[PDB]
Amino acid sequence: LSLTGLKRAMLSLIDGRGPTRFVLALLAFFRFTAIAPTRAVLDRWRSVNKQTAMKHLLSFKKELGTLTSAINR
Amino acid sequence: RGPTRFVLALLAFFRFTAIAPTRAVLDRWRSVNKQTAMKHLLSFKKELGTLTSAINR
Amino acid sequence: LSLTGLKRAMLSLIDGRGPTRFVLALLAFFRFTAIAPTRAVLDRWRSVNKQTAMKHLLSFKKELGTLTSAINR
Amino acid sequence: LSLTGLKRAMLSLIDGRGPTRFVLALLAFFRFTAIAPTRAVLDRWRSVNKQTAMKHLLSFKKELGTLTSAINR
Ligand SMILES: [Ca+2]
Ligand SMILES: [Ca+2]
Ligand SMILES: [Cl-]
Ligand SMILES: [Cl-]
């Protein structure tokens, strides 16, 4: 459920903890929307493993792509 | 309901996280003005870019 | 073969005609490497169909993605 | 002929060596265009310094961005 997934987001922005990619997804969204991210989320963005952090951001880029080429029709 | 960019940002997030988006969010993704929808997605791509190059150091 | 593709490229390079995405690929290349494109290539980049031109550049972006996530291991 | 930025782009494929960025740019182009890259080009792709290789690929991504953004007007 997306309810399971909402709640996750909500704890994830309260504490910076929880799934690496979720916190990164949150960060991307906090940037997409002109919103200042929570200290707990920002704190994590400075700690995440460079290699893993890139893995995830890159697939976000990919996801955006499928959304873009979708709207090209 | 609410800001075009916000709903799209939500959509992006729902795809980044492997979460199935709510019908009300999906419903709007089919209605968005092609032109404006593009403008936004493209700026998302740009923001991801800033984050990537940041982690390259 | 690729020599077929090479001669194809070289042709597209002097006279900017030939396949839309090839000329756009060339253009990406001429930007990737800091080289100033031929008048014939540049002249086409102002004429390309907005929608088609977009389709292609987006696919390039995709291609680069597979290359980058490749280097992440 | 009167193309300084060809005669080395010549070398590159029939001769695996030369600037790291150039070789990766060629690789990008060989992927954008549905062309199978030369052994000598592919050989280098396996040897490039991961860190430098990513620096370059990410700047390509950026270049494609300016080109996309451009076509959106
Ligand atoms: Ca984890
Ligand atoms: Ca064509
Ligand atoms: Cl969590
Ligand atoms: Cl041809």
The answer, for D14 touching chain B at a CB cutoff of 8 Å, is: no
- Domains of chain D (ranges; CATH) run 1-73 (1.10.10.930)
**Backbone angles phi and psi of A39, in degrees to 5:** -50, -40
Q: How far is CA B37 from the centre of its chain?
A: 9
Contact indicator for B51, A66 with CB cutoff of 8 Å? no
> How far away, in angstroms, is C45 Cα from ligand 2 center?
13
Q: What amino acid is encoded at C56 in this protein? A: H
Q: What is the DSSP string of A12-50?
A: HHHSS-S-HHHHHHHHHHHHHTT-PPPHHHHHHHTTS-H
In angstroms, the separation between the Cα of residue B1 and the nearest Cα of chain A is 15
Q: Please state, in angstroms and as integers, the Cα–Cα distance from residue A18 to each residue in A23, A61, C63, following that order.
A: 7, 21, 31
Cβ contact C20:C53 at 8 Å: yes
Is the CB of residue D56 less than 8 Å from the CB of residue B26?
no
> End-to-end distance of chain B based on CA atoms, in angstroms?
39
| B42–D contact, CB cutoff 8 A | yes
Q: What is the resolution of this structure in A?
A: 3.2
Q: Which of B52, C67, D61, D49 shows the shortest CA–CA distance to A54?
A: B52
Amino acid sitting at position A41: V
Contacts of B48 in chain A (CB under 8 A): 28, 57, 60-61, 64
Helix, strand or coil, per DSSP, at residue C30: helix
Alpha-carbon span A14 to C52, nearest angstrom: 44
Residue C33 C-beta-side C-alpha neighbours within 13 Å: 26
Experimental technique for the deposited model: X-ray
Strands (DSSP E) along C1-73, which ranges? none
Question: Where do runs of H (alpha helix) occur along B17-57?
Answer: 23-29, 34-55
User: Chain B residues with CB inside 8 Å of A60's CB?
Assistant: 12, 16, 48
